[PDB]
């Protein structure tokens, strides 16, 4: 028994995660990693005999586009239904989220006080001129965030926001989320937007250098007075032509079960989807916050206008 996993997850803990699965079920995991868009293209180009059993992403919107293109097959699992909140899985059992991550404002403690922060929209304020940095618009975390702004504020307003946000950049987008945190820590900028688990990793690192970086940067959950902080998920679905549907289903059921949920929360610093599972202490220290649960099912359709907006605004 084996499954062919196509995953856009890119963490050093993924190997142990999959190992946990095999040690529990005896099912071998053949892994193919790459960026979400690349994996979807590969699957579609490989045809009806593609080896792909499971498609794993770190973005809800890409999962939507995958389901739209009919790449998944329905799965009805009692464990999936009970463990995964309805709003975090496909109404037709096409895909399911198994972790949650928040894209929040991370700021230099010495240069910024929390009282000066509020919403994502405010980051376009002239006050932040030459003090903001963020990774490239090509990244899905950013595209999904911009999509949520389109959904909540509209295309016209988001375009205006993006132009202002870009005008505030201290440097052109370079590096990943962690590179942004380090740059803010080093005084190259005062704030950025990154996923919570990246800060969790730095705070929990055995490398003193990483922990030192974390100490200079604080975390702020935006839009608390309104829709809430933008929350995305790491999701998964069984490919329609999966050669081993049985193993594929067991894999997804494994991901949402207590053992895997606890590991993901404790070792990869993400928010588990299963209730009753404790967060990593460092992540717990961020505090409680309101999550945006209303803009989720409309994010996918908003991808197109979001990317158009990011391009027009000059967000490289
Ligand atoms: Fe990530």
Listed residue (290, 302, 316, 297) closest to 149, CA to CA: 302
Q: From the CA of 233, how far away is ligand 1's center (Å)?
A: 10
Quote the ligand 1 centre to 120 CA distance (angstroms): 20
Are 53 and 182 in the same domain?
Answer: no
Crossing angle between the packed helical segments 208-215 and 177-185, to the nearest 10 degrees: 70
Same domain, 124 and 238: no
Residue the block writes with tokens 């096409």: 94
Distance CA(194)–CA(104), nearest Å, equals 6
Residue 205: its H or E element = none
Name residue, tokens 């070792």.
267
CA 291 – ligand 1 centroid, Å: 18
Using DSSP's 3-state secondary structure scheme, residue 104 falls into strand
193 and 311 inside one domain: yes
Same domain membership, residue 186 and residue 171: yes
Q: φ and ψ at 232, to 5 degrees? A: -115, 175
Q: Experimental method used, please?
A: X-ray
198 is in an annotated binding site: yes
Cα–ligand 1 centroid distance for 137 (angstroms): 15
* Domain co-membership, 274 together with 220: no
User: What is the stated resolution of the deposited model, in angstroms?
Assistant: 2.0
User: Strands 54-57 and 231-238: what pairing?
Assistant: antiparallel
Q: 11: annotated binding-site residue?
A: yes
Alpha carbon of 268 to ligand 1 centroid (Å): 10
Among 19, 10, 31, 5, which Cα is nearest to 197's?
10
In angstroms, the CA 79 to CA 90 distance is 15
d(CA 190, CA 199): 16
Domain count for the chain, please give it: 2
Output the CA 139–ligand 1 centroid distance in Å: 10
Euclidean distance between the first and the last CA atom of the chain, given in angstroms as a whole number: 44
Closest to 195 (Cα-Cα) out of 131, 144, 125, 252: 144
* 116 CB burial (10 A radius; 0-12, 13-18, 19+): middle
Query: Residues 70, 176: one domain?
Result: no
Burial call 8-18: b when 16+ CB within 10 Å, e when fewer = bbebebbeebb
Ligand 1 centroid, distance to 9 Cα (angstroms): 7
Angle between helices 299-312 and 155-167 (to 10 degrees): 50
Query: Within 13 Å of residue 224, how many CA atoms lie on the same side as its CB?
Result: 12
DSSP state of 52: -
Write the CATH number for 239. 3.40.190.10
How many CB atoms within 10 Å of residue 272? 22
178 and 312 together in one domain: yes
Which residue segment(s) compose the domain that 4 sits in? Answer: 1-101+233-279
Q: Cα 29 to chain center, whole Å? A: 23
| Residue 238 shares a structural domain with residue 187 | no
* 94 and 203 both lie in a single domain: no
CB distance 101 to 234 below 8 Å:
yes
| CA angle, residues 62, 267, 286, in degrees to nearest 5 | 80
User: How far is residue 283 from each of residues 104, 107, 229, measured CA to CA in Å?
Assistant: 13, 16, 15
The verdict on whether residue 120 carries a ligand-binding annotation is: no
How many angstroms separate the CA atoms of 122 and 236, rounded? 33
Same domain, 13 and 87: yes
State whether 51 and 15 are in the same domain: yes
Residues 215, 240 within the same domain: no
């Amino acid at each position: 028994q084996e499954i062919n996993l196509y995953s856009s997850r890119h963490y050093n803990t993924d190997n142990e995660l999959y190992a946990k699965f095999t040690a529990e079920t005896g099912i071998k995991v053949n892994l193919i990693e790459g960026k979400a868009d690349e994996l979807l293209e590969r699957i579609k180009s490989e045809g009806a005999n593609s080896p792909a059993d499971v498609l794993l992403t770190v973005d809800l919107a890409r999962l939507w586009r995958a389901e739209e293109d009919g790449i998944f097959q329905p799965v009805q699992s009692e464990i999936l239904e009970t463990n995964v909140p309805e709003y975090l899985r496909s109404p037709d059992g096409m895909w399911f989220g198994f972790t949650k991550r928040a894209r929040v404002i991370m700021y230099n403690k010495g240069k910024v006080k929390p009282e000066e922060l509020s919403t994502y929209e405010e980051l376009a304020d002239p006050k932040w001129k030459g003090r903001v940095i963020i990774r490239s618009s090509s990244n899905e975390y950013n595209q999904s965030l911009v999509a949520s702004l389109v959904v909540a504020d509209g295309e016209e307003s988001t375009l205006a926001w993006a132009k202002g946000f870009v005008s505030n950049f201290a440097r052109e987008p370079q590096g990943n989320d962690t590179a942004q945190i380090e740059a803010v820590s080093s005084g190259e900028a005062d704030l950025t937007l990154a996923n919570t688990y990246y800060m969790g990793r730095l705070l929990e690192s055995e490398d003193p250098a990483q922990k030192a970086i974390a100490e200079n940067v604080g975390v702020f959950f935006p839009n608390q007075e309104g829709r809430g902080t933008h929350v995305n998920v790491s999701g998964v679905g069984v490919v329609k032509t999966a050669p081993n549907r049985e193993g594929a289903v067991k894999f997804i059921e494994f991901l949402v079960s207590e053992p895997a949920q606890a590991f993901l929360a404790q070792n990869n610093y993400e928010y588990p989807v299963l209730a009753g599972v404790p967060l990593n202490k460092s992540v717990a220290s961020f505090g409680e916050f309101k999550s945006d649960t209303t803009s989720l099912d409309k994010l996918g359709p908003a991808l197109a206008p979001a990317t158009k907006i990011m391009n027009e605004a000059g967000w490289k």
